Design a protein around this ligand. Structure first.
Ligand SMILES: *[C@]1(=O)[C]N(S(=O)(=O)C2=N[C]=[C][C]=[C]2)[C][C][C][C]1[N]C(=O)[C]([C][C]([C])[C])[N]C(=O)C1=[C]C2=C([C]=[C][C]=[C]2)O1
Length: 215
């Protein structure tokens, strides 16, 4: 077989989604990883509730931003995360209204990939499934990406400002990459996804704050 992987072909990744005017990328990145482990464990692909996270992970700041680890920790000690269906995404923080009745998954903690180590991230994506990663999506070059293996010498691995999901990795025009599921609607980039540079000195800090939930 090939030196690459794509969990979209295993039905691990739900349809692209759109944050709207809410800094909820962390929530979508978290839901993404959770959904992947859920499919892997129960064989059912399902959208988990990003709003549940936005309104209940108090260690984060709702539409102000957050970390995926805090999100996984929350799911763990809250002993559950509601499904999208049971806790719709309204794109604006409101009081926590988590309901045990709509629980569609749980977490048993999380593991973090060694900072800046793309080989470790590769192994993780291989062993586990979709992995949450943080990146530098400042550059306008990132803003209107549409195809190819994105790479911009101007990216700053120290400037992590967006949270997304790594659902695979491979090669293209002889370009090693990471298969990234963004959350700015299917309309953005190649159907919501974007291929980012791999083994290129940790371009855009793809491996500086990666993690996955245990389930
Ligand atoms: C996320 O929604 C990404 N948006 S964005 O609009 O998609 C965008 N992305 C890149 C460049 C420009 C626009 C922007 C900001 C909100 C949000 N980002 C985050 O939540 C990041 C996530 C990664 C760095 C891990 N984290 C925070 O901003 C953050 C973490 C916090 C916090 C407040 C309190 C506690 C933890 O903010």
């Amino acid at each position: 077989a090939p030196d690459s992987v794509d969990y979209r072909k295993k039905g691990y990744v739900t349809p692209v989604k759109n944050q709207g005017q809410c800094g909820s990328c962390w929530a979508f990145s978290s839901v993404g990883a959770l959904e992947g482990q859920l499919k892997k464990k129960t064989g059912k692909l399902l959208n988990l509730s990003p709003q549940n996270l936005v309104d209940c992970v108090s260690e984060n700041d709702g539409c102000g931003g957050g970390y995926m680890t805090n999100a996984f920790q929350y799911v763990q000690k809250n002993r559950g995360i509601d499904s999208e269906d049971a806790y719709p995404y309204v794109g604006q923080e409101e009081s926590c209204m988590y309901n045990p009745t709509g629980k569609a998954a749980k977490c048993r903690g999380y593991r973090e990939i060694p900072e800046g180590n793309e080989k470790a991230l590769k192994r993780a994506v291989a062993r586990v499934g979709p992995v949450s990663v943080a990146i530098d999506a400042s550059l306008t070059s990132f803003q209107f990406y549409s195809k190819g293996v994105y790479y911009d010498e101007s990216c700053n691995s120290d400037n992590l400002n967006h949270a997304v999901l790594a659902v695979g990795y491979g090669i293209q025009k002889g370009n090693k990459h990471w298969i990234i599921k963004n959350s700015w609607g299917e309309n953005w980039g190649n159907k919501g996804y974007i291929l980012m540079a791999r083994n290129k000195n940790n371009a855009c800090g793809i491996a500086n704050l990666a993690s996955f939930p245990k389930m």
